[PDB]
């Protein structure tokens, strides 16, 4: 019911925030690696 509904929306939303963050950090890892290899 209503409590479970809020629960699944929260799960979806927290996952969205997570995947966005880790996708950004993976991009950053690759940028950093490339910058460091220019030493």
Curated annotation (Swiss-Prot):
Covalent crosslink: Glycyl lysine isopeptide (Lys-Gly) (interchain with G-Cter in SUMO2): 5, 21, 30
Coiled-coil stretches: 3-32
Induction: Up-regulated by muramyl-dipeptide and lipopolysaccharide.
Post-translational modifications reported in the UniProt record: One of the most prominent phosphoproteins in various cells of mesenchymal origin. Phosphorylation is enhanced during cell division, at which time vimentin filaments are significantly reorganized. Phosphorylation by PKN1 inhibits the formation of filaments. Phosphorylated by STK33. Phosphorylated on tyrosine residues by SRMS. O-glycosylated during cytokinesis at sites identical or close to phosphorylation sites, this interferes with the phosphorylation status.
Domain of life: Eukaryota
Positions carrying N6-acetyllysine: 21, 30
Tissue expression summary: Highly expressed in fibroblasts, some expression in T- and B-lymphocytes, and little or no expression in Burkitt's lymphoma cell lines. Expressed in many hormone-independent mammary carcinoma cell lines.
Modified residues (Phosphotyrosine): 18
Coil 1A, as annotated region: 3-32
Modified residues (N6-succinyllysine): 21, 30
Cell location: Cytoplasm; Cytoplasm, Cytoskeleton; Nucleus matrix; Cell membrane
Subunit structure, interactors included: Homomer assembled from elementary dimers. Identified in complexes that contain VIM, EZR, AHNAK, BFSP1, BFSP2, ANK2, PLEC, PRX and spectrin. Interacts with BCAS3. Interacts with LGSN. Interacts with SYNM. Interacts (via rod region) with PLEC (via CH 1 domain). Interacts with PLEC isoform 1C. Interacts with STK33. Interacts with LARP6. Interacts with RAB8B. Interacts with TOR1A; the interaction associates TOR1A with the cytoskeleton. Interacts with TOR1AIP1. Interacts with DIAPH1. Interacts with EPPK1; interaction is dependent of higher-order structure of intermediate filament.
Family assignment from sequence similarity: Belongs to the intermediate filament family.
Free-text comment on this protein's domains from its UniProt entry: The central alpha-helical coiled-coil IF rod domain mediates elementary homodimerization.
Disease per record: Cataract 30, multiple types: An opacification of the crystalline lens of the eye that frequently results in visual impairment or blindness. Opacities vary in morphology, are often confined to a portion of the lens, and may be static or progressive. In general, the more posteriorly located and dense an opacity, the greater the impact on visual function.
Function: Vimentins are class-III intermediate filaments found in various non-epithelial cells, especially mesenchymal cells. Vimentin is attached to the nucleus, endoplasmic reticulum, and mitochondria, either laterally or terminally. Plays a role in cell directional movement, orientation, cell sheet organization and Golgi complex polarization at the cell migration front. Protects SCRIB from proteasomal degradation and facilitates its localization to intermediate filaments in a cell contact-mediated manner. Involved with LARP6 in the stabilization of type I collagen mRNAs for CO1A1 and CO1A2.
Protein name: Vimentin
Residues of the full protein shown: 102 to 138 of 466
């Amino acid at each position: 019911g209503s409590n479970e509904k809020v629960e699944l929306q929260e799960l979806n939303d927290r996952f969205a925030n997570y995947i966005d963050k880790v996708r950004f950090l993976e991009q950053q890892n690759k940028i950093l690696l490339a910058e460091l290899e220019q030493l």
